[PDB]
Design a binder for this molecule. Structure first.
Ligand SMILES: *C(=O)[C@@H](NC(=O)/C(=N\OC(C)(C)C(=O)O)c1csc(N)n1)[C@@H]1N=C(C(=O)O)C(=C)CS1
Length: 270
């Protein structure tokens, strides 16, 4: 508690203007200071599970030296809405590493479900998260079908705090071996779907990797990121939103604004 929320920030006004709930956890890995707002509430993961899926694949590759270069062939029935990379390789196959990069960097939906199969499904990914000490994360459903994200349903959710803690362990801590850690970081750094979220609060001359999520309905979208400000220790943060009513819109601008407040609360000049 000592170093949590040392400086107050107007998260409540931001979420009231948004018309929903915003969950934020941000960690200065140098000092241990944190910013925390609704940080232990559950929010839908949406596609943000895919970053952790790629990390689980990398963890497995530490024991399975051939995993990343394994070719995966798939049928047209594997292609679902928003599969921008895997649809181009339907007739050729893609490697596990390519599927991982597509899932992380284009939020390719078909690629994510193919990788989930390789890991033993939602319970297998959940097991990986338990293995790094995350007792909050839960993935419950396969990801071919357009799973609902309705309020109060704990399936396919985590908390901003657990997301941030797990992301820190995987990108900066010891949960992955060094080569795999850097590959996870590199995939996050190459993400193309987050330019209007946490990255919009981060100066262009700082390195940043992120993974986004967006669900249809209920104002539900999110982003998590590792940020390397120059000359100081990295920051790890997660911003999740939801809203009470089916037709409520999500907002990328609200995510960016919450990230700005988190950085300001940590005293990070940006
Ligand atoms: C992951 O979040 C993916 N999201 C989706 O497939 C869902 N909806 O997509 C949009 C475009 C928001 C829709 O209106 O259908 C979805 C998943 S579970 C649920 N109830 N809806 C992909 N990832 C991203 C991202 O931000 O990374 C998107 C922008 C949408 S596709």
């Amino acid at each position: 508690h000592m170093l949590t929320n040392l400086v107050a920030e107007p998260f409540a006004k931001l979420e009231q203007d948004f018309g929903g709930s915003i969950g934020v956890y941000a960690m200065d890995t140098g000092s241990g200071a944190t910013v925390s707002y609704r940080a232990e509430e559950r929010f839908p993961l949406c596609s943000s599970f895919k970053g952790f899926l790629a990390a689980a694949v990398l963890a497995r590759s530490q024991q399975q030296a051939g995993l990343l270069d394994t070719p995966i062939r798939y049928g047209k029935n594997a292609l679902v809405r928003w599969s921008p990379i895997s649809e181009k390789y339907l007739t050729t196959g893609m490697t596990v590493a390519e599927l991982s990069a597509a899932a992380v960097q284009y939020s390719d939906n078909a690629a994510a479900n193919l990788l989930l199969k390789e890991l033993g499904g939602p319970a297998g990914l959940t097991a990986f998260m338990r293995s790094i000490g995350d007792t909050t994360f839960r993935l419950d459903r396969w990801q071919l079908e357009l799973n609902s994200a309705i309020p109060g349903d704990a399936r396919d959710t985590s908390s901003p705090r657990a997301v941030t803690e797990s992301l820190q362990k995987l990108t900066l801590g010891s949960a992955l071996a060094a080569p795999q850690r850097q590959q996870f970081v590199d995939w996050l750094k190459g993400n193309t779907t987050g330019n209007h979220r946490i990255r919009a609060a981060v100066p262009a001359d700082w390195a940043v990797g992120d993974k986004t999520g967006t669900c249809g309905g209920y104002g539900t979208a999110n982003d998590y990121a590792v940020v390397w400000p120059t000359g100081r220790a990295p920051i790890v943060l997660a911003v999740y939103t939801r809203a009470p009513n089916k037709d409520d819109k999500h907002s990328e601008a609200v995510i960016a604004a919450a990230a700005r407040l988190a950085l300001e609360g940590l005293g990070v000049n940006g």
